[PDB]
Amino acid sequence: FLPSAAYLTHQQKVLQLYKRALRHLESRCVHRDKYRYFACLLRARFDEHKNEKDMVKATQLLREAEKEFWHGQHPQPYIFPESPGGTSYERYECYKVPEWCLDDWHPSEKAMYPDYFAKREQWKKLRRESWEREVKQLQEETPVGGPRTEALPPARKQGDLPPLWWHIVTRPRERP
């Protein structure tokens, strides 16, 4: 469950467990000083049997760590007020009007806003001009028939913008 690869790592699983354990330990422990104490305690707990070179014992004790962690989870974690499930989560989505719009204004409102609309027009000409040949030559020639990744190489050789740029660059501000 990731864009580029297929499996995380063993170390990446351990690392995600460390981050979530640190977060749940934050949510468990108030006053921040005994929290720093118990955080160094958990850092030493990972220092206990870190440096072994086994595989089966490593994944077995990692499983037992997951068991004693799912016991030791705090039930209502302090997630930040930008996280999914948090407090904002597109709080200001009321003013996140998409950018494909605004062409369908009456041109009196275009007479209200001359400079921004002329510059958006030259952005649109930059969009259309550098679109078909080079970008689709990359996206039809440069990979294998199996793409096997969700990334994309940039326009690395000569000329125009790196491919498929539009609805990732031209996006709302996420904060009006």
Partner 1 sequence: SHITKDMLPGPYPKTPEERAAAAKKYNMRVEDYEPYPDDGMGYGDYPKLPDRSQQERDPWYDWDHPDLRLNWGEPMHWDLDMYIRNRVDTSPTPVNWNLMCKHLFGFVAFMLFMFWVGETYPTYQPVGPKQYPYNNLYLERGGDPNKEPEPVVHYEI
Partner 2 sequence: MNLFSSLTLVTLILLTMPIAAINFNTHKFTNYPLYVKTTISCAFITSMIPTMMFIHTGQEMIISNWHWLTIQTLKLSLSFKMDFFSMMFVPVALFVTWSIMEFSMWYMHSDPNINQFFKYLLLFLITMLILVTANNLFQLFIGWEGVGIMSFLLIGWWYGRTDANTAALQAILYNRIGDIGFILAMAWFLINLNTWDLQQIFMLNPNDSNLPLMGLILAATGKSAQFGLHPWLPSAMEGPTPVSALLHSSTMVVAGIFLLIRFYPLTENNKFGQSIMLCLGAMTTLFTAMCALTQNDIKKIIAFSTSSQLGLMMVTIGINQPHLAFLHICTHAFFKAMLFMCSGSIIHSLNDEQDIRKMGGLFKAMPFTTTALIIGSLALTGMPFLTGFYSKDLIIESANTSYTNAWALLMTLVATSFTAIYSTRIIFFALLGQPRFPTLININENNPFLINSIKRLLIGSLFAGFIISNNIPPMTIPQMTMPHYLKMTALTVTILGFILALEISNTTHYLKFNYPSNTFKFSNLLGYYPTIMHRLTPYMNLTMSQKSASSLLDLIWLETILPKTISLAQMKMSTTITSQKGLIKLYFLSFLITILISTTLLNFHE
Partner 3 sequence: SFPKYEPSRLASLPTTLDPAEYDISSETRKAQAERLAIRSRLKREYQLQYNDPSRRGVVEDPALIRWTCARSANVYPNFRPNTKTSLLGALFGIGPLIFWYYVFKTDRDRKEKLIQEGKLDRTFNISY
User: Quick one: which of 14, 17, 38, 165 contacts partner 2 (CB under 8 A)?
Assistant: 38
Which one of partner 3, partner 2, partner 1, none is in contact with 78 (Cβ closer than 5 to 8 A by kind)? partner 2
Query: Which CB sits closer to partner 1, 55 or 168?
Result: 168
| Candidates 1-9, 29-37, 105-113, 128-136; binding stretch for partner 1 (CB under 8 A) | 1-9
User: 36 to 75, contacts with partner 3 by CB under 8 A?
Assistant: 59, 63, 66-71
Q: Which is nearer to partner 3, 6 or 94 (CB)?
A: 6
| 76 interacts with partner 3 by CB under 8 A | no
| 2 sits near partner 1 (criterion: CB under 8 A) | yes
Q: How far apart are the C-alpha atoms of 136 and 140, rounded to whole Å?
A: 6
Asked if residues 98 and 51 have their Cβ atoms less than 8 Å apart, the reply is no
Output the six-digit token pair for 176.
């009006």
Q: Which two tokens stand for residue 35?
A: 């929290």
Residues 46-75 touching partner 2, rule: CB under 8 A, are: 75
HEC string of the chain? Answer: CCCCCCCCCHHHHHHHHHHHHHHHHHHHCCCCHHHHHHHHHHHHHHHHCCCCCCCHHHHHHHHHHHHHHHHCCCCCCCCCCCCCCCCCCCCCHHHCCCCCCCCCCCHHHHHHCHHHHHHHHHHHHHHHHCCCHHHHHHHHHCCCCCCCCCCCCCCCCCCCCCCCCHHHHCCCCCCC
Query: Among residues 146 and 159, whose Cβ is nearest to partner 1?
Result: 146
What character string, x for contact with partner 1 (CB under 8 A) and - otherwise, covers 76-115?
Answer: --------x-------------------------------
Q: Which residues bind partner 3 (CB under 8 A)?
A: 5-7, 13, 17, 59, 63, 66-71, 124, 127-128, 131, 136, 139, 146-150, 164, 166-167
Q: Which residues bind partner 1 (CB under 8 A)?
A: 1-3, 73, 75, 84
